[PDB]
Amino acid sequence: GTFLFTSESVGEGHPDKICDQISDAVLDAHLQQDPDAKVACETVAKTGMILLAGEITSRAAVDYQKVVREAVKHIGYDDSSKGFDYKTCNVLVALEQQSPDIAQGVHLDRNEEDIGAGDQGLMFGYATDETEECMPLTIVLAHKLNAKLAELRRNGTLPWLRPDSKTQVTVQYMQDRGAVLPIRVHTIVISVQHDEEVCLDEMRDALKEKVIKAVVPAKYLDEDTIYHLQPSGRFVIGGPQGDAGLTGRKIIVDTYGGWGAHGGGAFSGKDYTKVDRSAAYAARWVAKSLVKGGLCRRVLVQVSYAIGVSHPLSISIFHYGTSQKSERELLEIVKKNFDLRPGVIVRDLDLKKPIYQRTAAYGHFGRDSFPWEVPKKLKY
Amino acid sequence: GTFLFTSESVGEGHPDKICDQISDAVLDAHLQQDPDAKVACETVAKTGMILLAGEITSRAAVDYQKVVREAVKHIGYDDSSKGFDYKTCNVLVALEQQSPDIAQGVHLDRNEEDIGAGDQGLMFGYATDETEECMPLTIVLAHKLNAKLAELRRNGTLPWLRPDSKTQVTVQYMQDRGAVLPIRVHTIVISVQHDEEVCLDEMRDALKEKVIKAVVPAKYLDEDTIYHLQPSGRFVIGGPQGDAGLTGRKIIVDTYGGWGAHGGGAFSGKDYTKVDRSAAYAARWVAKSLVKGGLCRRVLVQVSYAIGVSHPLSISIFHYGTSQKSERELLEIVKKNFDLRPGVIVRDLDLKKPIYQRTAAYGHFGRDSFPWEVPKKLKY
Ligand SMILES: C[S@@+](CC[C@H](N)C(=O)[O-])C[C@H]1O[C@@H](n2cnc3c(N)ncnc32)[C@H](O)[C@@H]1O
Ligand SMILES: C[S@@+](CC[C@H](N)C(=O)[O-])C[C@H]1O[C@@H](n2cnc3c(N)ncnc32)[C@H](O)[C@@H]1O
Ligand SMILES: CN(C)c1nc(=O)[nH]c2cc(Cl)ccc12
Ligand SMILES: CN(C)c1nc(=O)[nH]c2cc(Cl)ccc12
Ligand SMILES: [Cl-]
Ligand SMILES: [Cl-]
Numbered sequence A, B: 001g002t003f004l005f006t007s008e009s010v011g012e013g014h015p016d017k018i019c020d021q022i023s024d025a026v027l028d029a030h031l032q033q034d035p036d037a038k039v040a041c042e043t044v045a046k047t048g049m050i051l052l053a054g055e056i057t058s059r060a061a062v063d064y065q066k067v068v069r070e071a072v073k074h075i076g077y078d079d080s081s082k083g084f085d086y087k088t089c090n091v092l093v094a095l096e097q098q099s100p101d102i103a104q105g106v107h108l109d110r111n112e113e114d115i116g117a118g119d120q121g122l123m124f125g126y127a128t129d130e131t132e133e134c135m136p137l138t139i140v141l142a143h144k145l146n147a148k149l150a151e152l153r154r155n156g157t158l159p160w161l162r163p164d165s166k167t168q169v170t171v172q173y174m175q176d177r178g179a180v181l182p183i184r185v186h187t188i189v190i191s192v193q194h195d196e197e198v199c200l201d202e203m204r205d206a207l208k209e210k211v212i213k214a215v216v217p218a219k220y221l222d223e224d225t226i227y228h229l230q231p232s233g234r235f236v237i238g239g240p241q242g243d244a245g246l247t248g249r250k251i252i253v254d255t256y257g258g259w260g261a262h263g264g265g266a267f268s269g270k271d272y273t274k275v276d277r278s279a280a281y282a283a284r285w286v287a288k289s290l291v292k293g294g295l296c297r298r299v300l301v302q303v304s305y306a307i308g309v310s311h312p313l314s315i316s317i318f319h320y321g322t323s324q325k326s327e328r329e330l331l332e333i334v335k336k337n338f339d340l341r342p343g344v345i346v347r348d349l350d351l352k353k354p355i356y357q358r359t360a361a362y363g364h365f366g367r368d369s370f371p372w373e374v375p376k377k378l379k380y
Helices: A015-033 A064-075 A100-106 A137-154 A200-215 A275-292 A327-337 A342-349 B015-033 B064-075 B100-106 B137-154 B200-215 B275-292 B327-337 B342-349
Strands: A003-010 A038-046 A049-057 A090-096 A121-128 A161-176 A179-194 A226-229 A298-305 A314-318 B003-010 B038-046 B049-057 B090-096 B121-128 B161-176 B179-194 B226-229 B298-305 B314-318
Touching (some): A003 A179, A003 B121, A015 A038, A015 A064, A038 B049, A049 B038, A049 B049, A064 A090, A121 A275, A121 B003, A137 A179, A137 A200, A179 A200, A275 A298, A275 A342, A298 B003, A314 A327, A314 B003, B003 B137, B003 B179, B015 B038, B015 B049, B015 B064, B049 B064, B064 B090, B137 B161, B137 B200, B200 B226, B275 B327
Parallel strands (some): A049 A090, A179 A226, B049 B090
Antiparallel strands (some): A003 A161, A161 A179, A298 A314, B038 B049, B121 B298, B298 B314
């Protein structure tokens, strides 16, 4: 019954993640002034460049140069020695208003509760009782390893660290009638951008002792655990200089790490009318509510929409064999307890609030008791 | 036992798909001259702009202006009336060499069979016996509806069509010990960019009669099937003008439509050393080989890598209950029959061949008998 499963995560300075954070910094800046801003902000990053491309219709007055540069500063790219500098990079803007054809078909002259979905598409929510936060241990550990790197970089413990990092954790699991039980950590990968002076052995030792041991419980690590620490051997060039980044290129790191499923939509840079984000958040809320409500040990939820139509076109449940109730019964409980129209989700999950940049690194789920992480008490 | 499942697809002129096709046109152009080109070409599209950003180390002499414009011409954006024109758009290039730190850690001075993975990451392969091509019916139908639109546009049957389109199909399934059996089509969505002159009723009638009926077997359609045809009511603005596109933003349309799982990596614009593509192709090959070999009715395969390391870090199998063999036994059969090092996958799947632009619309799988679609005869 044992098997392996692998998930990854990336740091705040990974170039795709830089784009997600900037996209969400732009969204938040708009929402601070105009709670009804229509935002679809893509970000692209390459050597010395942040480009914003997309569509925004808003009453806010946003200083894009300031918002972008402040987000880059927060990440830690503040000097040409690190490969990227918020003070001196190029910020290019190719932002237009939202298409009037989309606006008229989605929200113009519509009662908010009855606004149409901002696009068609499919979205999934997932929850697993293997951790208290109802997330896969593989991705929780991978996120915490990146967070630890950023912590040691920021506190000056490991001053040779740079913001760009990736981690990957393979866990050996057992299964019990569809639920999954972590046994041990089989393999860990860590790659992190570093300065020109530190040697490989100093980095590998610090990664094992100060990073992995500070995050992963010793009970999961043993003589057989495989460690791939700085496996490329050298990672001085990094950030956008090493690899072009784009918004919405870490959608599995943003969600469930390979577990469950994904509908394809990116979250960052989008207001609530874009169901790629709001309905995925609501589907996480449903899944977590079914697990915390004791109806199942793990569950996957699908929802789908058509542009301009408020009610979902379909809702589906996969409980992996972890409920005594059938999937048909769980679906009925979901339909009796939730209303997944985007104009209702916005109210339940408070999706006009400018907290989106906080979601754009370390996963959107299983952290900080955001509204979609607080289970709904179910009636049936 | 019945349930719904939804998948989507998009047309060749959907702005994200335009970027995938251009990224792969660039890759193919390099491979035609240098089979060992190292390519990591991202494309961004917005009104009047194609931007290439990324890293290429190659001995080829590629005319980016010509390659980009020819790809856009093929798609059909050839006039300002359509919102985008290959003859007169801006083509911007921000392409650098591959990071020497990556090159030295991945492939420099390495025997080809022993080249390291070009990155860490996880990848999944999936196959289902519900169609002969071993793909989910939901996404096969969604792809064929977009292909039909392009066919009717190109042959002049529906001259009001433009290249940007999206489709979505919800199928009602039954299940049989983990395998899935399509019963009927529950809902279809079609949205397609159109000219200023055609009215909504003419478009809705043509979409039902000339598109849906020409693709979806009548046995799946009944009095209860729901049709959302041009649900936004107006879609004159389209292509990159209506919505910024990026490479690798249709990864679920590229794969399994919500079925199975995804590791997060984009395929287009990457040579074989980027396991995001090669290992996903190999994992599809494994899954399809297990189903066509009669070992299971449907199956999901995970593989993972560390940058610079040739052998996968993990391999896992989920057979949904559709094999008499355990997942442990199937994994042993996979390890005895396949070698998922990238330097072996390249030889088995002929991944230096410049056929990538052909993969960049209508899904990478279940079409055209590419090498990863030809099952391997298994020995056990
Ligand atoms: C390996 S790069 C993708 C391939 C790359 N575009 C190329 O040209 O080969 C993906 C991510 O890996 C990380 N990376 C960059 N340089 C690296 C290095 N020298 N060693 C390890 N990881 C690296 C960064 O997080 C980067 O965004
Ligand atoms: C709805 S747009 C995404 C949201 C958009 N960025 C915004 O500013 O609201 C996503 C895709 O839908 C399609 N689309 C564009 N305009 C549309 C319209 N008027 N009606 C329906 N679909 C449309 C195109 O395929 C486009 O790439
Ligand atoms: C066989 N069934 C019931 C499913 N098979 C899957 O592969 N995944 C699913 C995902 C959802 Cl959300 C619902 C149903 C299924
Ligand atoms: C419980 N097991 C065996 C799994 N549970 C999943 O949810 N998905 C999987 C995917 C793969 Cl590739 C392998 C195993 C599993
Ligand atoms: Cl990456
Ligand atoms: Cl889209």
